[PDB]
Amino acid sequence: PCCEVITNVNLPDDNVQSTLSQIENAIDVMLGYIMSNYDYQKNLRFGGSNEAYCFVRITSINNNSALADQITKLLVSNLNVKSRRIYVEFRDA
Amino acid sequence: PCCEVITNVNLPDDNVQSTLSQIENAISDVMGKPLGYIMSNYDYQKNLRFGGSNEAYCFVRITSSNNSALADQITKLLVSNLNVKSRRIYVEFRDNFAFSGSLF
Amino acid sequence: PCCEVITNVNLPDDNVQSTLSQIENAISDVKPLGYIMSNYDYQKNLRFGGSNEAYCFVRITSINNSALADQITKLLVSNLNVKSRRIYVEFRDCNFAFGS
Numbered sequence: 001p002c003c004e005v006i007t008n009v010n011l012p013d014d015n016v017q018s019t020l021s022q023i024e025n026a027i028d029v030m031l032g033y034i035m036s037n038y039d040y041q042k043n044l045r046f047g048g049s050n051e052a053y054c055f056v057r058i059t060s061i062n063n064n065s066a067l068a069d070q071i072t073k074l075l076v077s078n079l080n081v082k083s084r085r086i087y088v089e090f091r092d093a
Numbered sequence: 094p095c096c097e098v099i100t101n102v103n104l105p106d107d108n109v110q111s112t113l114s115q116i117e118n119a120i121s122d123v124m125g126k127p128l129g130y131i132m133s134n135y136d137y138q139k140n141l142r143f144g145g146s147n148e149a150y151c152f153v154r155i156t157s158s159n160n161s162a163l164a165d166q167i168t169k170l171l172v173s174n175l176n177v178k179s180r181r182i183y184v185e186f187r188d189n190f191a192f193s194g195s196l197f
Numbered sequence: 198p199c200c201e202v203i204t205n206v207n208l209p210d211d212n213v214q215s216t217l218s219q220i221e222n223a224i225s226d227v228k229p230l231g232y233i234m235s236n237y238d239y240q241k242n243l244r245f246g247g248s249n250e251a252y253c254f255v256r257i258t259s260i261n262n263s264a265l266a267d268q269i270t271k272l273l274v275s276n277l278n279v280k281s282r283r284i285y286v287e288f289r290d291c292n293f294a295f296g297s
């Protein structure tokens with residue numbers, strides 16, 4: 001279980017932790033053993049543009065739409081980013 | 094696609110953005126892959142090492158032949174814009190379900 | 198050859214470089230070290246188990262892996278003052294590279 005949010009959107013730590021906690025909760029869909037991270041990369045681009053954007057890699061779920069949807073709400077609401085600027089990737093020690 | 098530049102070389106944001114723009118152009122030109130459809134990123138890791146040494150260095154992951162023309166063209170840009178030695182630039186071509194958030 | 202340590206544990210640079218040098222030695226002991234990258238990526242908001250307490254993810258790409266894993270887990274436990282229960286080690290065997 002691993003979720004990483006990669007984004008040029010800067011949030012305060014209290015708010016990052018809230019968002020990550022909400023995603024872990026999401027990731028009901030399929031625990032105590034799980035990584036999540038919020039990686040701030042100001043210079044991150046998509047579509048030739050450096051304005052607000054979120055890449056999310058989720059590893060290890062097959063269900064997947066319910067997760068993606070739920071996550072896309074969380075990020076759109078907590079990060080005040082346009083949903084057309086969110087990409088969600090699944091990969092399926 | 095995704096291009097990520099991973100480097101202990103610190104550049105100002107105006108310069109980072111230029112450099113990334115030049116690479117996207119490169120990928121786009123040399124590979125004929127769709128423009129706008131690419132992530133690029135510049136990840137600053139001051140403690141990044143290669144060869145036992147923390148001197149200036151660039152790792153470039155390209156994710157998802159012509160390939161040398163790209164690698165070459167990128168290696169100029171980084172050497173020129175980052176003022177780094179070309180002997181300290183490694184270019185890695187690297188290889189599931191995907192979604193946009195507008196579908197929701 | 199690439200080792201990346203991903204952790205919310207903040208260390209001073211002198212100490213980070215030390216730790217990375219010790220790992221390269223490990224990876225080397227268990228080819229030689231001129232053909233390798235290592236990095237220590239500080240992500241303060243990194244969580245595991247629903248908790249932001251000290252933790253280490255290590256990706257090691259392109260290399261008896263147990264000898265490596267064990268030896269690195271000692272280094273990180275010692276140098277980062279972190280609980281071994283909070284350290285996970287991944288190997289990847291994921292394709293070419295091209296300056297000098």
Ligand SMILES: Cc1cc(Oc2cccc(O)c2)cc(-c2ccccc2)n1
Binds near residue numbers: 087095131132189
């Ligand atoms: C169709 C496609 C495009 C792709 O390039 C990207 C990756 C991230 C964002 C993006 O806009 C394109 C990567 C992938 C991909 C991602 C992970 C593993 C294998 C392929 N697949």
